[PDB]
Structure formats: C-alpha cells, structure tokens
Design an enzyme around this catalytic site. Structure first.
Site, PDB file in Angstrom:
ATOM      1  N   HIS A 143      43.232  35.648  28.876  1.00 41.51           N
ATOM      2  CA  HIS A 143      44.110  36.134  29.922  1.00 41.51           C
ATOM      3  C   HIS A 143      45.012  35.014  30.430  1.00 41.51           C
ATOM      4  O   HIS A 143      44.843  33.844  30.101  1.00 41.51           O
ATOM      5  CB  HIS A 143      43.298  36.708  31.076  1.00 41.51           C
ATOM      6  CG  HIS A 143      42.354  37.793  30.675  1.00 41.51           C
ATOM      7  ND1 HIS A 143      41.466  38.363  31.559  1.00 41.51           N
ATOM      8  CD2 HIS A 143      42.153  38.413  29.489  1.00 41.51           C
ATOM      9  CE1 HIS A 143      40.759  39.288  30.936  1.00 41.51           C
ATOM     10  NE2 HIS A 143      41.155  39.339  29.679  1.00 41.51           N
ATOM     11  N   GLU A 178      45.988  55.206  34.819  1.00 37.91           N
ATOM     12  CA  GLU A 178      45.169  55.532  35.979  1.00 37.91           C
ATOM     13  C   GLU A 178      45.988  55.843  37.224  1.00 37.91           C
ATOM     14  O   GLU A 178      45.715  56.823  37.918  1.00 37.91           O
ATOM     15  CB  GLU A 178      44.181  54.407  36.258  1.00 37.91           C
ATOM     16  CG  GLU A 178      44.756  53.022  36.203  1.00 37.91           C
ATOM     17  CD  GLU A 178      44.773  52.449  34.811  1.00 37.91           C
ATOM     18  OE1 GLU A 178      45.212  53.162  33.889  1.00 37.91           O
ATOM     19  OE2 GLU A 178      44.358  51.287  34.638  1.00 37.91           O
ATOM     20  N   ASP A 189      40.621  44.884  32.331  1.00 38.67           N
ATOM     21  CA  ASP A 189      39.244  44.521  32.607  1.00 38.67           C
ATOM     22  C   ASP A 189      38.276  45.554  32.035  1.00 38.67           C
ATOM     23  O   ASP A 189      38.661  46.556  31.428  1.00 38.67           O
ATOM     24  CB  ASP A 189      39.033  44.366  34.109  1.00 38.67           C
ATOM     25  CG  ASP A 189      39.317  45.638  34.869  1.00 38.67           C
ATOM     26  OD1 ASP A 189      40.189  46.413  34.427  1.00 38.67           O
ATOM     27  OD2 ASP A 189      38.673  45.864  35.913  1.00 38.67           O
ATOM     28  N   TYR A 211      48.435  40.743  35.782  1.00 43.07           N
ATOM     29  CA  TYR A 211      47.191  41.358  36.215  1.00 43.07           C
ATOM     30  C   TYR A 211      46.521  40.495  37.260  1.00 43.07           C
ATOM     31  O   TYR A 211      46.468  39.273  37.143  1.00 43.07           O
ATOM     32  CB  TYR A 211      46.260  41.577  35.036  1.00 43.07           C
ATOM     33  CG  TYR A 211      45.191  42.588  35.319  1.00 43.07           C
ATOM     34  CD1 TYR A 211      45.464  43.718  36.027  1.00 43.07           C
ATOM     35  CD2 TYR A 211      43.927  42.425  34.841  1.00 43.07           C
ATOM     36  CE1 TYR A 211      44.506  44.633  36.271  1.00 43.07           C
ATOM     37  CE2 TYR A 211      42.963  43.343  35.091  1.00 43.07           C
ATOM     38  CZ  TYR A 211      43.257  44.442  35.807  1.00 43.07           C
ATOM     39  OH  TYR A 211      42.282  45.372  36.057  1.00 43.07           O
ATOM     40  N   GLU A 237      36.496  47.581  33.643  1.00 40.63           N
ATOM     41  CA  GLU A 237      36.610  48.864  34.307  1.00 40.63           C
ATOM     42  C   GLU A 237      37.584  49.770  33.573  1.00 40.63           C
ATOM     43  O   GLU A 237      37.334  50.971  33.405  1.00 40.63           O
ATOM     44  CB  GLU A 237      37.038  48.667  35.753  1.00 40.63           C
ATOM     45  CG  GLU A 237      36.982  49.942  36.584  1.00 40.63           C
ATOM     46  CD  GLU A 237      37.390  49.719  38.031  1.00 40.63           C
ATOM     47  OE1 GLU A 237      37.833  48.599  38.359  1.00 40.63           O
ATOM     48  OE2 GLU A 237      37.273  50.665  38.839  1.00 40.63           O
ATOM     49  N   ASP A 254      43.782  49.351  32.534  1.00 39.68           N
ATOM     50  CA  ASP A 254      43.930  47.930  32.798  1.00 39.68           C
ATOM     51  C   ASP A 254      43.053  47.099  31.866  1.00 39.68           C
ATOM     52  O   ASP A 254      42.204  47.610  31.141  1.00 39.68           O
ATOM     53  CB  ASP A 254      43.580  47.633  34.245  1.00 39.68           C
ATOM     54  CG  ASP A 254      44.552  48.263  35.214  1.00 39.68           C
ATOM     55  OD1 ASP A 254      45.720  48.479  34.831  1.00 39.68           O
ATOM     56  OD2 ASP A 254      44.152  48.536  36.364  1.00 39.68           O
ATOM     57  N   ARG A 293      43.335  40.499  38.346  1.00 37.03           N
ATOM     58  CA  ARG A 293      41.919  40.215  38.162  1.00 37.03           C
ATOM     59  C   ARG A 293      41.780  39.252  36.998  1.00 37.03           C
ATOM     60  O   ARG A 293      41.793  39.674  35.841  1.00 37.03           O
ATOM     61  CB  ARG A 293      41.137  41.479  37.904  1.00 37.03           C
ATOM     62  CG  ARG A 293      41.182  42.448  39.037  1.00 37.03           C
ATOM     63  CD  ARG A 293      40.320  43.638  38.744  1.00 37.03           C
ATOM     64  NE  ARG A 293      40.253  44.552  39.868  1.00 37.03           N
ATOM     65  CZ  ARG A 293      39.428  45.586  39.927  1.00 37.03           C
ATOM     66  NH1 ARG A 293      38.585  45.850  38.948  1.00 37.03           N
ATOM     67  NH2 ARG A 293      39.451  46.377  40.998  1.00 37.03           N
TER      68      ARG A 293
END
Ligand SMILES: [Zn+2]
Ligand SMILES: [Zn+2]
Ligand SMILES: [Zn+2]
Length: 846
Positions: free
Chosen positions: A346, A8, A94, A300, A96, A92, A302
């Site tokens: 995670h 991204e 998540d 990461y 999203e 990533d 998040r």
DNA sequence: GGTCAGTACGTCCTATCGATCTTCGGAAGAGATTCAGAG
RNA sequence: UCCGCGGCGCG
DNA sequence: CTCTGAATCTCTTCCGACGCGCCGCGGGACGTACTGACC
C-alpha cells in the site's frame, strides 16, 4: 456488452462513474448485505450456537443471514447480475472489502468465471484505468482472515457476557481487544491516582547586555549541585543570594541544527496529527477521511505503509520545483522506512492530485477541507529540504549558582514553510550575541512554584499510538476500538481525555484474574500476527480458531465455577455509616453498569427482609483549565482528597445538596470512604446541552404542544431554537429584516429577508396570503448592505457578477450547509460558483 | 459524462401546558365498594 | 367538486 | 370476628323526528437542492 460494478457507498458509485463511463453500470451495495444473526428472530449449547450463528465444535459452520431491509438491494443486484455479463467487485482494499466482495459473490451465484475483484487505492482516472485493465481474482485467504476475526469476536462476546451477567452485573459486554484497551486505560488511571505530586521551585533572571540588549535566563545549579528548592523560604533565600552575587557569562556555545520533515501520514499518524492540530476526534477524523477518499481527493485512509508511488514522487517533486525552487527540492527523494510487517504493498495517505488546493474542494465541508489541507501539507513537506537553524547556549555564573539560556534562530525554512508550527516554542527566541566571557547587568528576578506532573491521561490519539506500539489492533480497527470502549460503558471521554469508570476497573480486575491468557498484551499481539499470517497464506484459519477456542474454553470452564473453587469473585460491597431512608441501616457503595450508587445491605436478604431502596449519586466532573496548559492535569490531581488507609486519591460524588461523598480510588478493594458537609449546588440536569448564541448561556431541551424545542436557561433570555429531522439542533436563525424598497411582482407586497435551515431568502410580508418567495441577488444585498445583520454582511462582499458578466444569486448548499453565490444565464446555471473559505471568496467553475 | 426527472428537506412558526371552543337528561351495562347472612 | 362549521327560515 | 355473595353505588357509553331553502366562513402548498437512471 454491459459490465456491472458493485461498490459499497453511493458516493463511491458516483466518483467511480466519474471514470468508468457509459459502457459499465455501477450499483451501490450499501454496507454489509450478509452478516451473522443479531436479533432473536444439552439444548443450552444449541441455543448458544443458534445465537452466535457459529458452531465452533462442528468445524465452524457459519449460518450467515441477510439483515432486514437488505432484501430489496439483494433482489436488485441479482436482477442486474442476470442482465449483466461480467460482475466487478470494486470494494475497498482492506480485508473488510474482501469480505464484502465474498458475500456478494456468494449471494449472486455463478462463481467460477463471472466475477473480477478490482483493486484501486485512489478513485482517479489513471488508477481506475489500471485497475480495470487487469482485474484480479477474489483472494479467499483475506476473506478467511476477516471471518476468523469476526468469529473470535462473536465467540468471546456471547460466551463471556452471560458470565459477567451472572457474576458482576447485568448489562455488561466484553470483547477481545476492547477488554485490552480498557485494561490499558485502567492501568494508566491507577498509575495516575497512585501519584503523589512533589513540589519544587525555580528562579528566572533578567539581564541587560553592555550593548543594551535584553536576555532572560533560568537558574539551574547551586553549589555545583542541581538547584531545586523545596519550600518558599528556601526559594526566597536563594533569590536573595542570587541578588547579592555578581553575574558573568562564563560559557558561550553555538551550533548549526537541522530539522527534517515528518513522514507521510499512515492512519495512526493522521489521527494523532488531527487531534493535535485541528482538534478532531478519531471518529470525526476517519469519517472525514472516508469522505475525502470517496470523493476522490485522497488515497485510501486505512494503511500502515509510508511508501509512495513513483508517480506521486514525481508529481510532488515537480510541484516543488515549479513553485518553491531548487533550494527546496532536494537533490534526491526523501525515503521513509515503515515497519517490516506493514502492508508495504500500500501507499501512504496522500492527495490524488497535488495541484488541487484545499479551498477548491467545493463539495466538501469545512472540516473536510481542513483535513485535506493537513494531508496536502504533510505530503508536500515530506519531500522538501530540511530546515536550518543556528542554536545559541549561554551559561552565566554567580557565586555558588549557575544559570542557563538556550535559543535558536531560523535561517532556512524549507520544510517549515508549508507546515508551520502551531505556536512558538520556548527555544524559539532571539538570544543576543553576547561575547565569550562577557559581562551582564541584572534586573529583578522572579520565583516560580511547580508540582511534578503525573503521567499524562490518554487522549484518543495517544491511546491509538499506544495500541500501535504494542501491536494491539490494526489500521482498520483503531476507530472501532476507540468507539466501542466508550459505547460499552467502561471508559468515558471528557476534556478530550480518557477517564476510566469504576465498572471498567471491576471488569478489568476480574478478567485479568480469570482470563489471564486472553488479556495479556503479548498474546493479543500474537493473535493479531497470526491473523496476518493467515492473510499471507502462512497459516490455516480453522487451525488458529480451534487453538484459541480450546484455550478459551478451558479458561471459561475454570472460571464459571464457584469462588471457593476459584471462579470469578462477585462485586464485593463497601459498607458506610449512612442511614437508609427505608430501614435506617448502614449503606454500602455499589457499582452497576449505570454507575456508582449507594445501596442497602437488605438487597442481600430474602424477600421477607429484603430492602430495594437505593440512593443515586452524581459524580463530580473534573474541569481542566485549558489556560493552565500542562498544569491542568496536575492541578486536577492536587484537587482530590487522599484516602486515609492508603495514599491513593479519592473520587468525589454528591449525595445531598448538603452532603458530598469521597470514595477511594481502589474501591472496593480499599474500603476507605469519607463524608463531607457543605453547600453544594446539585447539577440537577441531564440531556442535551447547547450554547445560546444570544447570551452564551446554557440551553436545554424542553417539550411542549409543538413537540421538542431548545430554550436558554437565562431568565433574561428567551431565545428558542428547534429540533429538526436529522440534526442535533437547528442553526441560529437570524432575525427577519424587512426591505420596503424591493417590490413583489405577482402581488403588491414588499419583500422581507428571512433566514433558516433552507438558507437566506426573500418572502412577501403578507406571507400567508401572497406566498411569493425568491432568492436574493448579490447586487440586491449590496444595495441594502446596511440593514443586513452583522453575520450576513459577508454575503454582500461576495462577487456580484461572473467572469461572463452574468448576475449572481445566493444559494444554499445543503450537503455542506453553507451559502455560496452562483451565476445563471437564461435561467440555467452558468456553472460558476464562489464559496466563502476562510474570510475570502474563492470562485470557480462548478 | 451529462441531462432530466424524481425525491428529499425546509419555510410558514411556534415553546407553556393556559387555548379553548368548555358544563343535558335518561337508560343500560360493567366495575368497584359496602352490607347482611352464614360459618 | 367535496367536507365541515356557524347562522337564519319554512313545512 | 371473618369471609363471601348479593345488592347498591359510581363511572362510562349510547341515543335524541323527517323534509326543504338561503347566507357566511374555513379547509397545505410551493420552492430549491441533491441523487439516480438512462442515453
Ligand atoms: Zn434499607
Ligand atoms: Zn484507599
Ligand atoms: Zn440565552
């Protein structure tokens, strides 16, 4: 062969190229390439479903679209995919990222076996190697969950905003979780404004030991009852009685105490810590965290899991063993337990390499370095030995009164060494070693007055903490909630605190009245848990979407009806005795999305008798005093008037340089208003506000023949800065300094030192003619150190030569906007650079 | 991964409208305003 | 090599 | 006494000979850092 990896961010592309190599090609797909429609480019239902893109009745057909400007990237990605053999989606972790990967897959084509989803929690050699060793399939369930969330948000927004426009005011917006956040803020505001502060006094005493040591204690009891005087006279009487009485230390207590380190940072904890220590907001915190992750230094950003990998545990334990010693190890690893519903797969937010100190981050800005230092310190501390204190408690009796003192002395600083406290606490003092049943001598005593504190206003960190407590929102949504509640005009943030606008109160009341199911905290939490269940493949996304849509449609059709039928009440008016400048009639207080204003009743009359005249108000800003500490809020509440009809405080607005207005907190539910007369300096300004570096005064934005500039308001100061292409305002350019001793080489002129956004450079004095410029050397600056202004002198302190003995030159890093010194050999950079980090120069290979 | 080429941003430099040079005659067309005639 | 401006001169 | 049309007034735009010679002056360009692609 050649394999394509799609990521991204371009920074992510570079960092992942730092470990993939020549065999792979990495392309950066900037942002979301495929999304639901945004612009305009039973027919009402058709128009609504075309606007939303989603058709809830027809089994949730999506009609995704590619936003303008993404077509070029789509074409390039398609061409590369045709060239390539295996396409890797390395977004990533998540949901999203999964959604982005699914969008890429749907755009490119050849689904069955041409794509592999890469999962890595940190951009490092080992992590990338393991991630590309066994790539995973695209997880459709998570994509479905993300799409369900997006559909819910879009449905609520586009099906409530017209209703709010019709009933309350045009320009409103709504959101499923945004509304709940506004409700939390509004409830806190109502609790605060309902609070009527009490008053209470306290007494502090000074004593000297027979050994001569000094002690300070606080009186806490009278007549064996709690000591809490109400009025000043009572306080003076108590002080006199205390002075008359004789003191003796009747109670001595000692106890060892331990303090364990905090758990490693989950996203919410990281935001709270950043706000408390470094003062960063949530937006800045997450932006810098994303930069650090993309650069490859931290994991990461998040997450909600405090778990740590065995590799990380071993690494940090080795660092502690090597640097600190065995007294700080400790024997076994420090485990921390997260929520059972947390993404335990995670890790926490930890450094990717413990040996990389914050000063060594050459490519990160100063704020980023501070954030990384916070993360590193937390990670180191989380596995260190608990710190040891010894606590002393003293109680001294005198007549009918008892006074107390408490303190602690630190003896082992195992976890506090790496993570020191911001300031010393009230118990961080040294109580002298008085004996049991000892005696004391007295000094003069001091009284103090205090008012009971109201509930604390929400900070961004505190609101995020509350959301985490209630189950509203998730780690990937906290920043969005915080940003959106502000952008939508329902809540503002001032003094690093949350304040609720009146429009927020109106919308919150209406939404609670009509859509009670949507706004309830438990139902929002249950919806989030249902989305999580969908992600875990425990539920079908279309099913829960249908259930929510059915309930919401029932509530909406109930609410759209007339107020007598039970629909949403309109924005009721509160009338006040003020002369309308147009028709002299009494004027009401109204609220629009722009703010709170004074209108005339003629707005409600037909055009024959209509009146559109309005009076614009300017609310008074509460200026909390940082020096007052915890008092800053309390004093604020004490400053406000109180409504006559109810005890709720009132908010202040200015109507004339002679006249000020006070509106009740529960407006328009409560119609209390007050008008005051006096000399009031109207603010009379709006727009950018900058601080003049030359006199500290306010600086404002003005426009002229050369475009837009910034000028200081002080009539004694004419300092002017300029607006540039991609910044709020130019940095404080310093005054040019001529140097007659440095001669030009292509001409006969002499060099002059200049400053600017480009940096610090040398230019010919006849600049329009000679036009000769070159960067200064460090030795050159040291030669003329005296002439340099006070700021630039630090450049003269920078090391003048590299370890190889080559000569250094002053350069400007635009990505970090800071000056550094770099060495060059044969005209090529030697790769050695020294930067200025916290009052010292740190040097290293580039 | 490292190197080269290409691309992007800054400096010169502003900040009061004030610098600045500045001011024809005749004819035709379009738009706006006023007067006379009719109702 | 282009453009522009200013000034001067001749038929 | 009022309304509409025609007439008059005001404002804006366009045009103003051809050819040739000489002199002077002016006119965005250069540097550095960062990012992407290819090897
Ligand atoms: Zn009016
Ligand atoms: Zn009231
Ligand atoms: Zn100033």
């Amino acid at each position: 062969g050649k394999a394509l990896v799609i990521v991204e961010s371009p920074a992510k592309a570079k960092t992942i190229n730092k470990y993939l190599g020549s065999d792979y090609v990495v392309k950066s797909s900037v942002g979301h390439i495929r999304d639901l429609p945004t612009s305009g480019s039973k027919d009402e239902r058709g128009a609504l479903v075309n606007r939303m893109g989603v058709d809830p009745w027809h089994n949730w057909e999506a009609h995704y679209e590619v936003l303008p400007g993404k077509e070029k990237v789509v074409s390039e990605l398609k061409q590369l995919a045709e060239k390539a053999d295996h396409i890797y989606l390395a977004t990533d972790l998540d949901r999203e990222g999964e959604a982005i990967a699914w969008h890429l897959r749907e755009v490119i084509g050849g689904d069955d076996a041409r794509y592999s989803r890469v999962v890595f929690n940190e951009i490092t050699k080992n992590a990338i190697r393991q991630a590309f060793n066994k790539p995973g399939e695209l997880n459709i369930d998570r994509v479905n969950a993300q799409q369900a969330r997006r559909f819910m948000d879009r449905v609520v927004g586009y099906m409530v905003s017209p209703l709010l426009w019709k009933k309350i005011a045009r320009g409103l917006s709504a959101g499923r979780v945004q509304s709940v956040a506004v409700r939390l803020v509004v409830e806190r505001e109502r609790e605060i404004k309902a609070f009527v502060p009490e008053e209470f006094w306290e007494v502090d005493a000074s004593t000297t030991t027979p050994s001569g040591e000094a002690l300070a204690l606080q009186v806490t009891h009278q007549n064996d009852k709690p000591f809490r005087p109400v009025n000043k006279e009572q306080t003076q009487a108590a002080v006199s009685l205390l002075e008359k009485a004789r003191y003796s230390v009747l109670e001595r207590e000692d106890k060892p105490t331990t303090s364990k380190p905090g758990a490693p940072f989950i996203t919410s904890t990281l935001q709270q810590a950043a706000s408390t220590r470094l003062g960063f907001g949530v937006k800045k915190t997450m932006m810098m965290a994303q930069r650090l992750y993309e650069a490859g230094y931290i994991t990461y950003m998040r997450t909600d899991s405090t778990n740590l990998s065995q590799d990380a545990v071993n690494m940090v334990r080795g660092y502690i063993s090597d640097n600190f010693g065995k007294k700080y190890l400790p024997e076994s690893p420090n485990q921390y337990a997260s929520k059972e519903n947390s993404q335990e797969a995670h890790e926490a937010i930890r450094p990717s390499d413990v040996n990389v100190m914050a000063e060594s981050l050459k490519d990160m800005e100063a704020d980023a370095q501070k954030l990384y230092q916070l993360i590193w310190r937390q990670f180191v501390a989380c596995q260190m030995t608990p710190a040891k204190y010894d606590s002393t408690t003293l109680t001294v009796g005198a007549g009918d009164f008892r006074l107390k003192a408490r303190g602690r002395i630190l003896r082992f600083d195992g976890w506090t060494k790496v993570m020191p406290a911001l300031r010393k606490g009230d118990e961080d003092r040294i109580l002298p070693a008085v004996n049991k049943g000892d005696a004391l001598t007295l000094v003069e005593l001091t009284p103090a007055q205090h008012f009971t504190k109201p509930p604390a206003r929400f900070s961004e960190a505190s609101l995020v903490k509350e959301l985490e407590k209630r189950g509203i929102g998730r780690p990937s949504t906290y920043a969005s909630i915080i940003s959106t509640i502000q952008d939508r005009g329902y809540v503002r943030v001032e003094n690093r605190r949350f304040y609720a606008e009146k429009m927020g109160e109106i919308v919150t009341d209406r939404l609670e009245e009509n859509f009670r199911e949507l706004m309830n905290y438990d139902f929002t939490a249950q919806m989030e848990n249902s989305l999580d269940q969908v992600a875990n493949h425990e539920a079908e996304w279309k099913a829960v979407l249908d259930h929510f849509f059915s309930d919401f449609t029932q509530q909406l059709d109930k609410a759209e009806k007339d107020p007598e039928e039970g629909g949403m009440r309109p924005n009721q008016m509160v009338l006040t005795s003020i002369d309308c400048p147009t028709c002299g009639r009494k004027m009401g207080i109204r609220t629009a999305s722009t703010g709170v204003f004074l209108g005339c009743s003629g707005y409600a009359l037909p055009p024959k008798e209509r009146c559109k005249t309005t009076i614009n108000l300017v609310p008074e800003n509460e200026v909390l005093n940082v020096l007052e500490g915890e008092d800053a809020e309390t004093n604020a509440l004490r400053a406000k008037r109180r409504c006559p009809k109810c005890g709720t405080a009132m908010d202040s607005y200015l109507i004339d340089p002679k006249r000020k207005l006070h509106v009740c907190g529960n407006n328009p539910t409560c119609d209390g208003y007050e008008i005051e007369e006096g000399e009031f300096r109207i603010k009379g300004y709006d727009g950018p506000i900058v601080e003049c570096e030359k006199c500290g005064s306010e600086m404002h934005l003005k426009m002229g023949r050369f475009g837009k500039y910034m000028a200081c308001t002080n009539e004694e100061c004419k300092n002017t800065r300029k607006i540039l292409r991609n910044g709020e305002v130019a940095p404080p350019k310093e005054d040019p300094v001529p140097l007659p001793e440095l001669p030009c080489e292509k001409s006969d002129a002499y060099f002059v030192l200049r400053d600017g956004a480009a940096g610090v450079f040398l230019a010919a004095n006849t600049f329009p003619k000679s036009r000769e410029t070159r960067a200064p050397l460090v030795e050159e600056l040291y030669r003329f150190r005296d002439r340099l202004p006070e700021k630039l002198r630090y450049l003269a302190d920078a090391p003048q030569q590299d370890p190889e003995g080559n000569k250094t030159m002053v350069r400007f890093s635009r990505k970090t906007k800071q000056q550094y010194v770099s060495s060059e050999k044969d005209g090529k950079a030697t790769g050695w650079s020294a930067f200025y980090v916290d009052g010292k120069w740190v040097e290293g290979k580039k």
